[PDB]
Paper text:
Forkhead box H1 (FoxH1) is an essential maternal pioneer factor during embryonic development that binds to specific GG/GT-containing DNA target sequences. The members of the FOX transcription factor family share the presence of the forkhead domain (FH), which interacts with DNA (InterPro entry IPR001766). Most FOX proteins recognize the canonical forkhead DNA motif TRTTTRY (R = A/G, Y = C/T). In contrast, FoxH1 recognizes the TGTG(G/T)ATT sequences in several cis-regulatory elements, such as in Gsc, Eomes, Nodal, Mixl, and FoxA2, to confer activin regulation in vivo.
Residue numbers in the entry: 114 to 234
The structure:
Amino acid sequence: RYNKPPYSYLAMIALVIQNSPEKRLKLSQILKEVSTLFPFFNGDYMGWKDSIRHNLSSSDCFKKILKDPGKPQAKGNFWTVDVSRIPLDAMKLQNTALTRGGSDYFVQDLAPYILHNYKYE
DNA sequence: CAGATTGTGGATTGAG
DNA sequence: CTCAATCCACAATCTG
């Protein structure tokens, strides 16, 4: 357990994918857009990059984009979230000891910004 | 071609 | 109890 923002990785990835131009994003583009939106990874640790890559494959919300039907074994494909399938309790703010008080720092729920067309600060 | 990155997924941990 | 976070491993493409 390392210092990460109190939002599930699923909601973090789902946000940057919807906030993107064509609602598709490559792994690297997901990595840097997540890092700047939730600026709590600019330190020494690096394993959070794996956790995101692992979350994309291990969730049925995220699907790949087929570049070439002749090479379906290709990598670097853009990922697309399918918002309707995101459990509503996965977007709420994570109950940790960091959010015992002073919670006014972070929003309570990312559903408006993910599936309701609102702007995240 | 070596080294970096992607995609997958099996297994353990700490915490709620 | 449960489950997100983290670990570590392997396979295979991607890049220069």
